[PDB]
C-alpha cells in the first residue's frame, strides 16, 4: 500500500571535475528530498510541501549524511574501476536503490537494498536481510568489505525500525496528498484513419498514483496486439496521464468500450463514444 | 597497528604543537579524539580519504587537522592554552563509519605557563635484602625515579642487556613529593623479583631504565641548571653472593 | 546524547565479572566495547548491532535495544584484565560517544601468604634507605604515611611467570636517619609479620 525509497546516483566524469552524487527520496510516487553535490555549497532541498515543516536539525543531518555519501561513492567509483581494470578516461555510474514497503495494515511488508554498476546488478541484500548476492568476483570484494563493516546488520535494523518509523511520520504529515488518491478524468475522442477504418482513443488524466490499467473491448474481449496503449507519463504537477487506441472498422465504433481501473475510482469505470 | 608521535609533549602557553597520526594502510576513515583524565574519548574531527567531513568536536579554530594524501594525518594546535592539556588519540576504520575502530597509543599533551618547573628524574637501584633470601628464597630489586616533572616517563627493567617483564611491577600512577605544592615534583617506584640463585650469581647484570620526556632543542632555556631535555636516566646493579 | 556505566568493578582471579551499560540517545546503530590500559591504546573487544550475544573467547557482550541496555561479561579473569573498559554508542554517521569508563580490579589469589618487611641498600647509601613490605594477602589495605618525609607507594602485584608465583608489594623510603622498618608502616598489618634485624 505505502513505501519509502531512496535513489542514489554516483557518476564519474574524467576531465569535467569531481564525480557527481545525486540522492533522491520518495514516498510512493511523490519525491520529497533531493541532494546534488554539483552546487557551490551542496544541501538537502525540500521537494514536497509536507517535508518543509521539518526543523533545521533534520536538514543539517540529511546534508551531513549525503555529503559523507558523496565522498564514499567517489572512492567506490575509483575502487570498482580498479576491480574491472577499467580506463581512467571513461565515465562510470554507481546506482543504489533501498527502502521499506508497508502493507495496508501499516507494518513492514518488505525491506530491500540493491546496487548497480553501469546499469548492471552489482550487489544486492537478500530477502533474509542478513546476506548479500554478488554478481561477480569484483562484487565479492565489496561483499567482504560490507560483511566486515556489519552493513547487513545495521541495514536490517534501519529497514525494520527508522525506515518504517519515518515513513509513518511522512504519511501522517502529508495525509492530504499521499493517503488521498486522485481519480482519472476519463473521456474518448474523434479520429479517422481510412475510409473503411477509424481509431478510437481512451484518455486518462490527472490521476495519482501512477498505477492504472486501460483496456479496449469489442463486446468484452482483450486486444493486446491491436491496442496501442502508451506508457504512463508524468503531467508535471505530480499527477499522471495515459491513453489507449484501437484500429476500428467504420460503423462498428459502438460495440467498442473502454475499461479504466484505478484506486481513485471505487469500482471499474466504463465509457463509450 | 595505528601509530602516533610524540608519545608525550610538554609545551609553553602560546607555542604551536604538531601531533602526528599514521593510520593502517588502506583505511578510508580517520578519527581524532580528546581524552580527559578519568573519562572516555570525545570526538574532534572525521576524515574520509583526504576530505574533512566534520570538525564540530574541535574546541576552536586554533585546532587545525589535515590529511592531505588520504593517509598520514596531522593535528596542529595554534597558540596552545592550559585547557588544551589532554591525551589526543587517533583512530581508523577500513571502509567507513559505524565500524570497528583501530586506535593509536595517543599523545599526552601538557601545556604550562612556563617550563621552569620541569626536571629530569634521579634513578637509584636498591639491592635485595639478605633476610629476604633467607626467608622466601627470592630476591626483590627496587628502583626509584625521584624529583621529575612532568609525569611524562616510561620505566623499564633490563637484565643482561635484554628487557624483562616477568616479576616486574611498576606503580600505576606516581606520587607527588610535595602533595601541598601546585608545581610538585613526582616520584615513581618499581620492583623486580628473581630467584635467590639468580641474584647471588655475579654474571647477571640488573639495570633500571627511565625514559624521560622533556624539552626539545627548539625550546628556550636561560636558567643556570642544565636543560631538562628528553633523556634516559639509568641505575645498574650486579650479582652479590655475600 | 550520553551513556552510563559503573565507575569501578572488582573481582577475584579466575572468577567472572559483568560491566553494565545503558545509553540515552535519539538514534541507535551499534554498541561496542573497548579495553584501555593506563596510557595505552583502546583496543576493540566486541560489537552489537542487533539484539543478542556476541562471543569472542573469554569475553562476551549482550544487547537489548528496547531496554537501551547492554553488558560486557569477562570469564576466567587474569591479572592482565585489570584495565579500563569503555562502552561506545554509534547513533548514525561516524560520531561515536564513549562512556566515562569502568576500571576493573582483578584481585590476585595468594595461595601461601608470607607477610614480611625487609631493608634494601643502594650501591651508594648517600641518599636514603628502602623498606619493602611483600608476600601479603590481597585482603590487606595500605594507607598513606603520617610523616611528611616518609613516602609509601600503593600495593601492586608482580607475576613470576616461570615459577607460576604472584605476590603483593609496597615500597617505603625516607632520607631521615629516624626512619626504620619497625615504625615504617601505619596501616592495619598482619600480626605474623617477620622483622629480622
Amino acid at each position: 500500500s505505502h513505501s519509502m525509497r531512496y535513489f542514489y546516483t554516483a557518476m564519474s566524469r574524467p576531465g569535467r571535475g569531481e564525480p557527481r552524487f545525486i540522492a533522491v527520496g520518495y514516498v510512493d510516487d511523490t519525491q520529497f528530498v533531493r541532494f546534488d553535490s554539483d552546487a557551490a555549497s551542496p544541501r538537502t532541498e525540500p521537494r514536497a510541501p509536507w517535508i518543509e515543516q521539518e526543523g533545521p536539525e533534520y536538514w543539517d543531518r540529511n546534508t551531513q549524511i549525503f555529503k559523507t555519501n558523496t565522498q564514499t561513492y567517489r572512492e567506490s567509483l575509483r575502487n570498482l574501476r580498479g576491480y574491472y581494470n577499467q580506463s581512467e578516461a571513461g565515465s562510470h555510474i554507481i546506482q543504489r536503490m533501498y527502502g521499506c514497503d508497508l502493507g495496508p495494515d501499516g507494518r513492514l511488508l518488505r525491506g530491500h537494498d540493491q546496487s548497480a554498476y553501469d546499469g548492471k546488478d552489482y550487489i544486492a541484500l537478500n530477502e533474509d536481510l542478513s546476506s548479500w548476492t554478488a554478481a561477480d568476483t569484483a562484487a565479492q570484494i565489496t561483499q567482504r568489505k560490507w560483511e566486515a563493516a556489519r552493513v547487513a546488520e545495521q541495514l536490517r535494523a534501519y529497514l525494520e525500525g527508522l525506515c518504517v518509523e519515518w515513513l509513518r511520520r511522512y504519511l501522517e504529515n502529508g495525509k492530504e496528498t499521499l493517503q488521498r488518491a486522485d481519480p482519472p478524468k476519463t473521456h474518448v475522442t474523434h479520429h479517422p484513419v481510412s475510409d473503411h477504418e477509424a481509431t478510437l482513443r481512451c484518455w486518462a488524466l490527472g490521476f495519482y498514483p501512477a498505477e492504472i490499467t486501460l483496456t479496449w473491448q469489442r463486446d468484452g474481449e482483450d486486444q493486446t496486439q491491436d491496442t496501442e496503449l502508451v506508457e504512463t507519463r508524468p503531467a508535471g504537477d505530480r499527477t499522471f496521464q495515459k491513453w489507449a487506441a484501437v484500429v476500428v472498422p467504420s460503423g462498428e465504433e459502438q460495440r467498442y468500450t473502454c475499461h479504466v481501473q484505478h484506486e481513485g475510482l471505487p469500482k471499474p469505470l466504463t465509457l463509450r463514444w | 597497528g595505528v601509530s602516533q608521535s610524540p608519545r608525550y609533549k610538554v609545551a609553553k602557553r602560546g607555542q604551536d604543537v604538531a601531533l602526528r597520526c599514521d593510520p593502517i594502510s588502506g583505511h578510508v576513515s580517520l578519527f581524532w579524539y580528546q581524552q580527559a583524565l578519568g573519562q572516555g574519548p570525545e570526538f574532534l574531527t572525521y576524515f574520509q580519504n583526504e576530505a574533512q567531513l566534520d570538525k564540530s568536536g574541535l574546541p576552536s579554530d586554533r585546532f587545525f587537522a589535515e590529511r592531505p594524501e588520504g593517509s598520514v594525518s596531522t593535528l596542529k594546535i595554534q597558540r596552545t592554552q592550559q585547557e588544551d592539556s589532554a591525551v589526543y588519540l587517533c583512530a581508523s576504520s577500513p571502509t567507513g563509519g559505524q565500524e570497528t575502530q583501530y586506535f593509536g597509543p595517543g599523545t599526552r599533551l601538557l601545556v604550562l605557563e612556563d617550563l621552569k618547573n620541569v626536571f629530569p628524574p634521579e634513578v637509584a637501584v636498591f639491592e635485595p635484602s639478605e633476610a629476604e633470601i633467607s626467608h622466601t628464597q627470592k630476591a626483590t630489586l627496587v628502583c626509584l625515579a625521584t624529583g621529575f616533572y612532568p609525569d611524562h616517563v616510561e620505566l623499564s627493567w633490563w637484565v643482561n642487556g635484554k628487557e624483562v617483564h616477568s616479576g616486574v611491577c611498576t606503580d600505576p600512577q606516581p606520587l607527588k613529593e610535595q602533595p601541598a605544592l601546585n608545581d610538585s615534583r613526582y616520584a615513581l617506584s618499581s620492583r623486580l623479583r628473581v630467584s635467590a640463585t639468580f641474584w647471588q650469581n655475579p654474571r647477571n647484570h640488573f639495570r633500571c631504565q627511565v625514559q624521560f620526556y622533556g624539552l626539545s632543542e627548539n625550546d628556550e632555556w636561560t636558567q643556570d641548571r642544565a636543560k631538562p631535555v628528553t633523556q634516559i636516566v639509568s641505575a645498574e646493579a650486579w650479582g652479590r653472593a655475600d | 546524547q550520553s551513556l552510563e556505566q559503573p565507575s569501578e568493578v572488582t573481582a577475584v582471579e579466575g572468577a567472572i565479572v559483568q560491566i553494565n551499560c545503558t545509553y540515552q540517545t535519539s538514534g541507535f546503530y551499534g554498541l561496542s566495547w573497548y579495553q584501555q590500559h593506563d596510557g595505552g591504546a583502546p583496543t576493540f573487544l566486541s560489537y552489537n548491532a542487533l539484539d543478542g550475544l556476541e562471543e569472542t573467547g573469554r569475553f562476551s557482550s549482550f544487547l537489548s535495544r528496547s531496554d537501551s541496555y547492554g553488558y560486557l561479561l569477562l570469564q576466567e579473569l587474569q591479572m592482565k584484565d585489570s584495565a579500563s573498559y569503555f562502552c561506545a554508542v554509534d547513533t548514525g554517521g561516524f560520531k561515536t560517544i564513549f562512556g566515562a569508563g569502568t576500571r576493573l580490579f582483578v584481585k590476585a589469589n595468594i595461595q601461601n601468604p608470607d607477610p614480611a618487611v625487609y631493608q634494601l641498600r643502594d650501591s651508594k647509601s648517600s641518599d636514603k634507605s628502602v623498606c619493602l613490605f611483600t608476600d601479603f594477602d590481597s585482603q590487606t589495605n595500605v594507607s598513606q604515611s603520617k610523616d611528611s618525609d616518609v613516602y609509601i607507594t600503593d600495593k601492586c602485584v608482580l607475576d613470576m611467570r616461570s615459577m607460576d608465583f604472584k605476590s603483593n608489594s609496597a615500597v617505603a623510603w625516607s632520607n631521615k636517619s629516624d626512619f626504620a622498618c619497625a615504625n615504617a608502616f601505619n596501616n592495619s598489618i598482619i600480626p605474623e609479620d617477620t622483622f629480622f634485624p
Partner: peptide, 9 residues
C-alpha cells in the same frame, strides 16, 4: 530519513 551508514565498495 536515509540510511546512516556510508560504506566504501
Amino acid at each position: 530519513l536515509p540510511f546512516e551508514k556510508s560504506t566504501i565498495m
